[PDB]
Design a protein around this ligand. Structure first.
Ligand SMILES: CCCCCCCCCCCCCCCCCC(=O)OC[C@H](COP(=O)([O-])OCC(O)COP(=O)([O-])OC[C@@H](COC(=O)CCCCCCCCCCCCCCCCC)OC(=O)CCCCCCCCCCCCCCCCC)OC(=O)CCCCCCCCCCCCCCCCC
Ligand SMILES: CC(C)=CCC/C(C)=C/CC/C(C)=C/CC/C(C)=C/CC/C(C)=C\CC/C(C)=C/CC/C(C)=C/CC/C(C)=C/CC/C(C)=C/CC1=C(C)C(=O)c2ccccc2C1=O
Ligand SMILES: CCCCCCCCCCCCCCCC(=O)O[C@H](COC(=O)CCCCCCC[C@@H](C)CCCCCCCCC)COP(=O)(O)O[C@H]1[C@H](O)[C@H](O)[C@H](O)[C@@H](O)[C@@H]1O
Ligand code: HEC
Ligand code: HEC
Ligand SMILES: CCCCCCCCCCCCCCCC(=O)OC[C@H](C)OC(=O)CCCCCCCC[C@@H](C)CCCCCCCC
Ligand SMILES: *C(=O)CCCCCCCCCCCCCCC
Lengths: 223, 50, 158, 54
């Protein structure tokens, strides 16, 4: 929309021309060109809050969003018009769809996640370390739209899963699996994170061994 | 490090953020981690004697 | 020093199908070919459109966009001198919003190519974009914006 | 030690030729039938279409 495009243009002008040069052409060695990234990429990066980025590091981290939903959409529309690319899913009302992106099937979502997502993230969407200062962020925080748009657009050092690699049905399934694993309570007691061997070993050596050795001292006698 | 970078108009070996971290941590180290502790170092050293 | 002069984030190409060519005063971004292929190749004689955004780096201008032709007989319908510190958007990349129903200068300089040669998506094809300031080879890819998977025939076990 | 194979900068390569698999040999000779019928001729099977051109 004309007013939407104007607002997105002005926010882009006063927020990121310093590294995605005016006219959306990326500044050499500061930031990539946004022509073609699409409305999905802006929603994902600016909603996660990574995109008004303030350093070149191994990886730009997620941080509190510096924009809200309406002007997030304004930036996304501006970028989409300039370049042309993927669009964020939306519901009948017109806002970013959240519940509609929870695919009904979760076992299929589980297989897709483990084959594709767990490679770097985790069994259950926890984090994972990458080559040099990089990592896969935890998926507990991301909302269904953010998960969908993260699969749709590889943000950085993430494979870009086009709508053909993962049909919107498959992306909804993976979103459902991610949400189910994130919000599902850990059976069997306090889940020591999601990583098994390391949290469990640390918990043993702290809780169980401190308890056992303290009981040994109590029953035993120093001498 | 900051001074070697600053001897030249260009960025010889320090990226902008590397230099910024440099002056940040230098100021913090030299105020809060060398001086404010060494005042109390001299205190512990001599004040009980004095 | 993962945030040194060699940082991963700064040296990151956009995660888009199109290719970016910085040679010359004008910079090319999101260069690709829209060419829906129904078979192994795109047969010669079928028009496939060429998408790209040309940005004039300097405000002092290289708005000519002379020929930008290669093997394929590139044709620039509705040619115009758009670049003045601004985007020259030749076509409508999938997801591009038409801001208004009316179109200024008719089509916004839409570029089409008659292949005269088989092409299949997943290959690199050279397109010599010629500007008055200079000329540049891009090795343009083939991009499919949002067309979902075409139903593959179900397999019959044997 | 380094593996013997190593790099090849020369001979940039050629675009792979379109694959044309050979018919399955006598071992996997089993394949979809083309149609059965009396076929009292040189052979036409149980499937024969036609296109009407103006
Ligand atoms: C939770 C589980 C239950 C916790 C409560 C049970 C006992 C805690 C009291 C700590 C003191 C103690 O054990 O000595 C008193 C006394 C031992 O006295 P004694 O052997 O007859 O003679 C001691 C001499 O004075 C000779 O003593 P000493 O002068 O050589 O030094 C005495 C003391 C001094 O050193 C200390 O560590 C003192 C600090 C004690 C505070 C510990 C609790 C702090 C709370 C933080 C969160 C804990 C979780 O060191 C200890 O005896 C402590 C050993 C290990 C620490 C125990 C807790 C950790 O024991 C008891 O009153 C009952 C002991 C029961 C056995 C369990 C001990 C370990 C359980 C902790 C598990 C931690 C993870 C579980 C989750
Ligand atoms: C080990 C030893 C005394 C050797 C004697 C000399 C000898 C025979 C040398 C030749 C053998 C060789 C080649 C040794 C080199 C490498 C080596 C030791 C290989 C064998 C490894 C092995 C089978 C056993 C060694 C294990 C060992 C004795 C550990 C120390 C045990 C003790 C008394 C620990 C302190 C008591 C205590 C309160 C422990 C709990 C507190 C904490 C948190 C301790 C630190 C800690 C530990 C100790 C974990 O194991 C651990 C595992 C997974 C996650 C986290 C942790 C962790 O945080
Ligand atoms: C000693 C025996 C007592 C054991 C405790 C028993 C308590 C039972 C707790 C209640 C029933 C089970 C809860 C299961 C649900 C549950 O697991 O509890 C989480 C919390 O988890 C956390 O954050 C940690 C919170 C901090 C408190 C617990 C810390 C205890 C540690 C220290 C004990 C081990 C000792 C290790 C020693 C360490 C170093 C010493 C040298 C809470 O939810 P949440 O927070 O949202 O989890 C996120 C998903 O949502 C989200 O997707 C997901 O992506 C994640 O972000 C996930 O965290
Ligand atoms: C290592 C290869 C890789 C694989 C494969 C991969 N991811 Fe990621 N993922 C990453 C990296 C790296 C990031 C961080 C992106 C950033 O920081 O901009 C990320 C970010 C995300 C996020 C954003 C979460 C947040 O809080 O910002 C989600 C959600 C996500 N991935 C889900 C998935 C899903 C679903 C799949 C399966 C389609 C998948 N990932 C496969 C590496 C990968
Ligand atoms: C250098 C500081 C910096 C600024 C400020 C910045 N960006 Fe970027 N941008 C980057 C970097 C670096 C990347 C790729 C790596 C990353 O995202 O961390 C990127 C990538 C992107 C992407 C995704 C590219 C893809 O292929 O997925 C989008 C969308 C984007 N930027 C838009 C924006 C918007 C909108 C703003 C203003 C809200 C902005 N940028 C501000 C540096 C910046
Ligand atoms: C051999 C052992 C004895 C050492 C002898 C003298 C050892 C003398 C060591 C000279 C070290 C010179 C520095 C050169 C750094 C550099 O320009 O390289 C670029 C590199 C790419 O930049 C980086 O990536 C990060 C480098 C940052 C180093 C942080 C170290 C902080 C340590 C803290 C974590 C505290 C640990 C506790 C340590 C406590 C130590 C107490 C003494
Ligand atoms: C990127 O990973 C880090 C960038 C920091 C570069 C500047 C480092 C300044 C020197 C720090 C001194 C550390 C302690 C030295 C012990 C002898």
């Amino acid at each position: 929309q004309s007013a939407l495009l104007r607002t997105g243009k002005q926010l882009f002008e006063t927020s990121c021309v310093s590294c995605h040069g005016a006219n959306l052409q990326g500044v050499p060695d500061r930031g990539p060109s946004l022509i073609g990234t699409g409305e999905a990429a802006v929603y994902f990066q600016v909603s996660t809050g990574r995109m008004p980025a303030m350093r070149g590091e191994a990886q730009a981290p997620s941080k509190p969003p510096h924009f809200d939903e309406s002007q997030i959409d304004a930036l996304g529309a501006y970028v989409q018009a300039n370049g042309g690319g993927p669009t964020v899913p939306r519901d009948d009302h017109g806002a970013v769809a959240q519940e509609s992106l929870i695919g009904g099937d979760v076992a299929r979502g589980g297989d897709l996640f483990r084959l594709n997502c767990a490679s770097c993230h985790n069994f259950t969407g926890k984090g994972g370390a990458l080559s040099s200062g990089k990592y896969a962020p935890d998926l507990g925080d991301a909302n269904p739209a953010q998960i969908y748009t993260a699969m749709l657009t590889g943000p950085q050092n993430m494979p870009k899963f086009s709508d053909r690699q993962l049909t919107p049905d498959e992306k909804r399934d993976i979103v459902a699996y991610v949400r189910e694993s994130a919000e599902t309570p850990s059976y069997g007691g306090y889940g020591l994170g999601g990583f098994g061997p390391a949290p469990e070993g640390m918990a043993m050596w702290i809780i169980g061994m401190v308890a056992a050795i303290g009981v040994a001292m109590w029953i035993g006698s120093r001498a | 490090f900051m001074r070697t970078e600053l001897a030249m108009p260009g960025l010889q070996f320090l990226s902008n953020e590397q230099f910024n971290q440099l002056f940040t941590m230098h100021g913090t180290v030299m105020l809060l981690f060398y001086a404010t502790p060494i005042v109390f170092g001299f205190a512990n050293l001599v004040l009980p004697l004095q | 020093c993962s945030a040194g002069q060699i940082s991963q984030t700064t040296t990151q190409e956009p995660a888009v199908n199109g290719v970016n060519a910085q040679a010359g005063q004008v910079s090319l971004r999101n260069v690709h070919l829209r060419a829906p292929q129904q078979t192994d190749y795109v047969e010669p004689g079928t028009t496939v459109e060429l998408l790209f955004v040309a940005a004039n780096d300097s405000t002092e201008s290289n708005k000519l966009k002379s020929i930008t032709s290669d093997v394929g007989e590139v044709t620039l319908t509705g040619d115009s001198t758009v670049p003045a510190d601004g985007v020259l958007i030749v076509g409508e990349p999938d997801g591009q919003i038409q801001a208004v129903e009316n179109a200024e200068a008719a089509d916004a300089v839409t570029a089409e190519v008659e292949l005269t040669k088989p092409i299949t998506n997943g290959l690199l094809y050279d397109f010599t974009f010629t500007f008055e300031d200079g000329e540049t080879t891009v090795a343009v890819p083939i991009s499919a914006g949002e067309q979902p998977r075409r139903p593959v025939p179900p397999a019959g076990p044997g | 030690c380094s593996p013997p194979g190593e790099t090849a900068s020369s001979e940039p390569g050629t675009t792979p030729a379109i694959w044309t698999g050979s018919p399955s040999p006598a071992a996997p000779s089993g394949e979809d039938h083309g149609g059965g019928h009396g076929a009292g001729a040189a052979g036409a099977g149980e499937t024969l279409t036609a296109e009407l051109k103006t």
